[PDB]
Amino acid sequence: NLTLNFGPGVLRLVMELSGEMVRKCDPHIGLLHRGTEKLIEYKTYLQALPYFDRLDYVSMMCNEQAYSLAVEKLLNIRPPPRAQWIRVLFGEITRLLNHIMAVTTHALDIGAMTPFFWMFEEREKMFEFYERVSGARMHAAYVRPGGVHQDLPLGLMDDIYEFSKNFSLRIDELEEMLTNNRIWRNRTVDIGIVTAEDALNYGFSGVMLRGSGIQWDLRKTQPYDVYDQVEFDVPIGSRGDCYDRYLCRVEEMRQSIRIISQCLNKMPPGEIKVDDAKVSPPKRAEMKTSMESLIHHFKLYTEGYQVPPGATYTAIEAPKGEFGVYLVSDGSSRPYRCKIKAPGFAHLAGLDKMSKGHMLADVVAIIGTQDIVFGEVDR
Amino acid sequence: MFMINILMLIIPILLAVAFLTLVERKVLGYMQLRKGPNVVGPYGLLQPIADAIKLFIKEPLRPATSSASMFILAPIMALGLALTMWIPLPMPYPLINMNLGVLFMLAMSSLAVYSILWSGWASNSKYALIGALRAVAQTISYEVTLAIILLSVLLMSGSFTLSTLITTQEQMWLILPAWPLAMMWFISTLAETNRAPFDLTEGESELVSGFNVEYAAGPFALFFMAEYANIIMMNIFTAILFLGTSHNPHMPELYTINFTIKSLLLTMSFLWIRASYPRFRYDQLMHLLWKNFLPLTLALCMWHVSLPILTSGIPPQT
Amino acid sequence: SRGEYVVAKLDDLINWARRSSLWPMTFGLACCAVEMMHMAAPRYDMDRFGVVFRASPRQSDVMIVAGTLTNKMAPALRKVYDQMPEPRYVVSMGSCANGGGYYHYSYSVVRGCDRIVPVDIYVPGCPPTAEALLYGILQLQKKIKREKRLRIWYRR
Amino acid sequence: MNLMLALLTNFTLATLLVIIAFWLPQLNVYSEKTSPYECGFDPMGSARLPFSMKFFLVAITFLLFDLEIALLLPLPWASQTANLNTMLTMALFLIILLAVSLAYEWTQKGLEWTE
Amino acid sequence: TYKYVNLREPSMDMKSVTDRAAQTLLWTELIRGLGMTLSYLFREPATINYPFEKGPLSPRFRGEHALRRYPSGEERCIACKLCEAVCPAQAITIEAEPRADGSRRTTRYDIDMTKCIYCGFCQEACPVDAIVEGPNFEFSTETHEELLYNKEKLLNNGDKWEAEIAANIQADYLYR
Amino acid sequence: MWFEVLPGIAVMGVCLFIPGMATARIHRFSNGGKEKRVAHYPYQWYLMERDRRVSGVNRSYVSKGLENID
Amino acid sequence: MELLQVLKRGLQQVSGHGGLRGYLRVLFRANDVRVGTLVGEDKYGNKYYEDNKQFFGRHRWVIYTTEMNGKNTFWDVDGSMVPPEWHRWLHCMTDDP
Ligand SMILES: CCCCCCCCCCCCCCCCCC(=O)OC[C@H](COP(=O)([O-])OCC[N+](C)(C)C)OC(=O)CCCCCCCCCCCCCCCCC
Ligand code: SF4
Numbered sequence A: 001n002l003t004l005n006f007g008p009g010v011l012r013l014v015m016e017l018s019g020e021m022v023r024k025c026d027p028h029i030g031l032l033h034r035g036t037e038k039l040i041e042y043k044t045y046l047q048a049l050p051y052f053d054r055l056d057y058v059s060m061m062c063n064e065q066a067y068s069l070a071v072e073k074l075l076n077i078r079p080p081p082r083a084q085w086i087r088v089l090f091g092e093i094t095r096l097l098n099h100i101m102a103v104t105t106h107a108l109d110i111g112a113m114t115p116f117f118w119m120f121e122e123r124e125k126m127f128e129f130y131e132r133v134s135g136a137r138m139h140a141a142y143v144r145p146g147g148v149h150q151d152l153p154l155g156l157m158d159d160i161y162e163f164s165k166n167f168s169l170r171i172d173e174l175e176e177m178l179t180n181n182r183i184w185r186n187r188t189v190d191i192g193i194v195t196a197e198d199a200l201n202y203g204f205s206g207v208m209l210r211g212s213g214i215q216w217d218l219r220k221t222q223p224y225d226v227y228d229q230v231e232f233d234v235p236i237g238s239r240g241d242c243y244d245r246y247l248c249r250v251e252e253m254r255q256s257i258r259i260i261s262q263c264l265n266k267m268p269p270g271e272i273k274v275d276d277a278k279v280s281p282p283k284r285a286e287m288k289t290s291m292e293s294l295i296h297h298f299k300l301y302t303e304g305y306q307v308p309p310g311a312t313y314t315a316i317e318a319p320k321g322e323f324g325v326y327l328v329s330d331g332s333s334r335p336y337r338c339k340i341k342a343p344g345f346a347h348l349a350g351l352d353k354m355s356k357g358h359m360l361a362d363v364v365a366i367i368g369t370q371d372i373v374f375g376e377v378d379r
Numbered sequence B: 001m002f003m004i005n006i007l008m009l010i011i012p013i014l015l016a017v018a019f020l021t022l023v024e025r026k027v028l029g030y031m032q033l034r035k036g037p038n039v040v041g042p043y044g045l046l047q048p049i050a051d052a053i054k055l056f057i058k059e060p061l062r063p064a065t066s067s068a069s070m071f072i073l074a075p076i077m078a079l080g081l082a083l084t085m086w087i088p089l090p091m092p093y094p095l096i097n098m099n100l101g102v103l104f105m106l107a108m109s110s111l112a113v114y115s116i117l118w119s120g121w122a123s124n125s126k127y128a129l130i131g132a133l134r135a136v137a138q139t140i141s142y143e144v145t146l147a148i149i150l151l152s153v154l155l156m157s158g159s160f161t162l163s164t165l166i167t168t169q170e171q172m173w174l175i176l177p178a179w180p181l182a183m184m185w186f187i188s189t190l191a192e193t194n195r196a197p198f199d200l201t202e203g204e205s206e207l208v209s210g211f212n213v214e215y216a217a218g219p220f221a222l223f224f225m226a227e228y229a230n231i232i233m234m235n236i237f238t239a240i241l242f243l244g245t246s247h248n249p250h251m252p253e254l255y256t257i258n259f260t261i262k263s264l265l266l267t268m269s270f271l272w273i274r275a276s277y278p279r280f281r282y283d284q285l286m287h288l289l290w291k292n293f294l295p296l297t298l299a300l301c302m303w304h305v306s307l308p309i310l311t312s313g314i315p316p317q318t
Numbered sequence C: 001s002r003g004e005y006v007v008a009k010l011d012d013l014i015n016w017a018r019r020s021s022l023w024p025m026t027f028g029l030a031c032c033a034v035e036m037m038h039m040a041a042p043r044y045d046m047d048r049f050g051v052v053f054r055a056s057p058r059q060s061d062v063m064i065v066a067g068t069l070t071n072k073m074a075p076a077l078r079k080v081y082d083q084m085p086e087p088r089y090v091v092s093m094g095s096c097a098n099g100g101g102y103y104h105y106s107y108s109v110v111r112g113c114d115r116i117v118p119v120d121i122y123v124p125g126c127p128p129t130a131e132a133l134l135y136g137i138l139q140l141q142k143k144i145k146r147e148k149r150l151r152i153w154y155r156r
Numbered sequence D: 001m002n003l004m005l006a007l008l009t010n011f012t013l014a015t016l017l018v019i020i021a022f023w024l025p026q027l028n029v030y031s032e033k034t035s036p037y038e039c040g041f042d043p044m045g046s047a048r049l050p051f052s053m054k055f056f057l058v059a060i061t062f063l064l065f066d067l068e069i070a071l072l073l074p075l076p077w078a079s080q081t082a083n084l085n086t087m088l089t090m091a092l093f094l095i096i097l098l099a100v101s102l103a104y105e106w107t108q109k110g111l112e113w114t115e
Numbered sequence E: 001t002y003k004y005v006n007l008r009e010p011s012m013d014m015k016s017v018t019d020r021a022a023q024t025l026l027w028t029e030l031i032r033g034l035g036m037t038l039s040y041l042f043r044e045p046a047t048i049n050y051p052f053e054k055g056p057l058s059p060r061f062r063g064e065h066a067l068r069r070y071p072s073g074e075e076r077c078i079a080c081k082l083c084e085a086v087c088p089a090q091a092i093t094i095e096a097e098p099r100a101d102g103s104r105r106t107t108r109y110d111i112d113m114t115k116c117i118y119c120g121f122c123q124e125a126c127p128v129d130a131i132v133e134g135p136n137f138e139f140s141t142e143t144h145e146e147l148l149y150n151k152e153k154l155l156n157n158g159d160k161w162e163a164e165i166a167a168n169i170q171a172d173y174l175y176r
Numbered sequence F: 001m002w003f004e005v006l007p008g009i010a011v012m013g014v015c016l017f018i019p020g021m022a023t024a025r026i027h028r029f030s031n032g033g034k035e036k037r038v039a040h041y042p043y044q045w046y047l048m049e050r051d052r053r054v055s056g057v058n059r060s061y062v063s064k065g066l067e068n069i070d
Numbered sequence G: 001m002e003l004l005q006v007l008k009r010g011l012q013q014v015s016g017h018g019g020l021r022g023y024l025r026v027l028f029r030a031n032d033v034r035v036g037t038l039v040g041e042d043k044y045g046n047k048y049y050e051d052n053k054q055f056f057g058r059h060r061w062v063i064y065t066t067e068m069n070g071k072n073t074f075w076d077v078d079g080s081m082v083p084p085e086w087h088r089w090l091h092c093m094t095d096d097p
């Protein structure tokens, strides 16, 4: 056949085309492989936290949450209730950040450019929530083993309410442009069909499973933090194609607003990190007056806290699918091994199967529907 | 005085094309909640001039293994034909008053497909030859419906003279009797000019390069002028064809103002559509032409051949 | 007149043209591409400075290297740079492209894209805010406004 | 005359812009430049594009359809005849055979793009 | 609890079939998409007039680094090297020795602003609020060497941004 | 705001208006203030050539009326 | 009547900048002719304006000085010319000038 080299995240496709049809798709990854998993072995558990902001750099605080849940599990400590509600609050804001990127850059790739600009004026307002809690628009490093770094600034919850009060209308404007559009439907309907059994055997997760009717979501089957105290519905597809997965992501954005409306009303008072100075650093006003607090501030920031020896696989329902870390501890301050299970790694491996009997222009649609970011695929 | 007339046509066209790039970036800007160029000159008015100077003082890269003769011929053919199609247009008085003006427009339009073909050949790339073949197949497919649609409308006008379409619409726009034909004509002029949602080559950026991806600097600018000169001309053709303006021989400037407004709005409709829709897959825009547009165009050609005869409304030959 | 006057004004004309029509080809490699997409978003709207959202390599004036540059990707970044018509400028965005960043000591990372291509402006941050990147582009316009290509040619 | 001057002016202006588009700018050429763009990676084969049969059939289908349009062009002048019944029958016969030609390719999978 | 996104049976009465035929032939739902972009053309754009207008930030913003002083002018840093231990990117290099008056002070304090990930761990670790990340984010350079800060550059930033760094710390230290 | 797009549109509109006005006013300047004769068919050309021989001067747009007949 | 009040606001921006020269000056230096309330002026010549009816992000702006530290800044304005005391207010890190 004809062998082409498409590409310049950055990807390289070695495709074999019989005219307009795709005969085999051979993704070449590692263009953004950086040795994150090897570098983490030279860092303390706190120093390794910013590495997870940079794996899936559209869902920063969900990557932080998964790592914190893993370290908290090996530590055998529990974050306080207010911190958990904050993590769910910003986990769902992070879901909106990712789904806007997934839906709108997917639409941009297939020629629909306008919705990208509308919804990136809402991302620019959600980046202000990130910046007001952590000081960084994207790589907050706000979620940490033990809870969150700082408490919410006064007035932030009023601004989260004003934003969420108008976001439903913005999703409707998006749907008015895509959902019933015949050109958009022709590019997504019956494209990249995945059967339920193939989806499971190929290791898919997230909307890839749910687009094909599989009723699975870790926020409901294996809840973490306070997701079992929030009411929301899990969208389920029927055809298993790109269009059904597109609707699942758009409906999930509406359910995040539903959850966010509850984290604002049910936010409890209290502290925002575990009241255990051998894990979480003391307050600065007590590190400067108490001898115990100064010793623990000194040790937590130089040596770090020791994690009991053990190995855990901890996973969360990240916006892109099941995100998990297999974290191995040897009893010291530094992880012995940290395998990062990126949901897009298994999805991309299934591009060759999902692209059988499709045109070259459907590969763009298929890659968009898998919601692939090569920071987490390559690591 | 005739050589003055030619320049009074060519130069304003190249200025209209220049400031269509500004309007496209500002109409798309505001439809996307932003402003577009407003820094280079007041309200961006100097932006086309900066882009023009920039392009013509940049390296005009030509790959060493490219056929030089065809690499140079293609932009000359494209722009030369782009300006040629403007000479018979009755705005309200043609520069060259042709008896077969409509057929001249079709004849020159079908020659412009060569520039796409020659440019693809000259690249010696094969990342652009496939693009050229895809682009050429699209263009020739959609000039089948342009000819048959245009033939159907001329059966209510009587002749191929472009000025006779003014007389035909002296009582009513041809869009009412022929709105089914006008709809497909508008889409067919979008696909001929490779405008969204039919831009599989120019800016698809979906594992498909454009036939002029290898052009840079001035030669790229010339292709751009030809492409944008055709967008205005096709929309001016649509205004004359379906939105005829009344012509007062004593105040001909009244026609030009009204006809200029309609052409601008139709041109701004091209910009409106690019901001609103995704793009057809290549095999879908062929099915649009061969399976949807062509069957309907043929039926409406049969209907418009027999409608004048059965209503005793055959137009005069002169 | 003096000759130097005509050349001085012609420099301003071509300097003004080149900085008012900067067409960037963005190498979105890692997270820093997201902050580059927020500069194209409505709030900052780089298109209003004459800076188009995206351009193909053959019509691009500046290359924005936005993200970690790995050894595997290094040959491909040089190839795209070599094929950019001149004048060509390179903006290094973020720590990873600037000097290696978080992954400086990695076995698979180019410790700064200035090892592969010349760089005209370095934008610091991890990531730089969309406004800090727009400050770099505006800082590249002033650099081009200081060029004296013709004044130097006139004195050869 | 007026037409020849117009064509000469249009195509001379295009040629002038091309020459000043190749001589005005400052050039600098080297082997890494002046190579096909590809996508940043080296070519994967020294062979030309494979021949695709489907792209050949659209060109032929356009040609045969374009030839039948040539016969339909004189219809506006044909409607002025005194033998309208004969003219109308032959006008509809030509268009119907054009549709029958379309129906044949459609049902024989001639308009598809799936290999 | 789950919900179906695309599980519907279109009605097959002539009223509904003719509605879908009208949509297919009259392009009704495509023109509805043109009305959504027409509305935006008549809204106020969200663009700001940078550099004359600036995007909003908070007191917690992490920008360019700076070394601070006490009100007397003595350097706050006492060369404890906590910021150097916690720095996840190893961007801080410190050398110290007793000063002529016997105090514990640095002789080298370099931040490689090209290794730094602007994470803020250095100002969290610091026990005397010496090293901070200021509010400046507009310090792009023309060379790689201008971004290898030494102690003189960092002390110049502190004396340059103290008026604004002090105010930001005053507005956020109760959350720390 | 949206009306800041009009200055670019007005410049484009004026450019599209010049070709139509110039042709209209050049023809009248070159044809004695009237519309340029349209000769699509030989009969229309025959009369125009006849008007060129009847004007005394070699110009088909100079009209001779009843004052030229006695 | 409302459309007639639009042209009046557009005419009082010319008078609000001190005639046609002041109007054209800010139009070509700042690409914007809005009139705000003068909040203050710094020792380098920058003038700071506010207009609280504008949407958040455009309700504060600075018209840069035409000369600073010996550099002609009439055309070459830069965001780093804002001193720290006004850098906090102009970026909305505080409500107190
Ligand atoms: C008694 C008198 C009898 C006289 C005859 C009566 C005629 C009755 C009416 C005839 C039917 C109407 C035909 C309308 C044209 C058919 C279009 C068509 O084929 O649709 C199907 C096609 C295909 O639809 P599909 O994708 O759903 O597929 C249909 C067929 N299947 C499902 C089997 C595959 O749709 C399109 O045309 C796509 C449109 C894309 C264009 C996007 C831009 C639109 C923006 C609006 C522009 C408005 C233009 C206005 C221009 C004005 C200029 C002056
Ligand atoms: S500099 Fe920071 S934001 Fe940019 S690619 Fe590197 S880690 Fe990501």
Ligand code: SF4
Pocket: E083, E086, E087, E088, E089, E090, E091, E092, E111, E115, E116, E117, E118, E119, E120, E121, E122, E123
């Ligand atoms: S911000 Fe983080 S990476 Fe930068 S110097 Fe401080 S601790 Fe190191």
Ligand code: SF4
Pocket: E076, E077, E078, E079, E080, E081, E082, E083, E084, E094, E122, E125, E126, E127, E128, E129, E130, E131
């Ligand atoms: S800056 Fe602070 S943490 Fe770093 S050495 Fe000085 S006192 Fe210690």
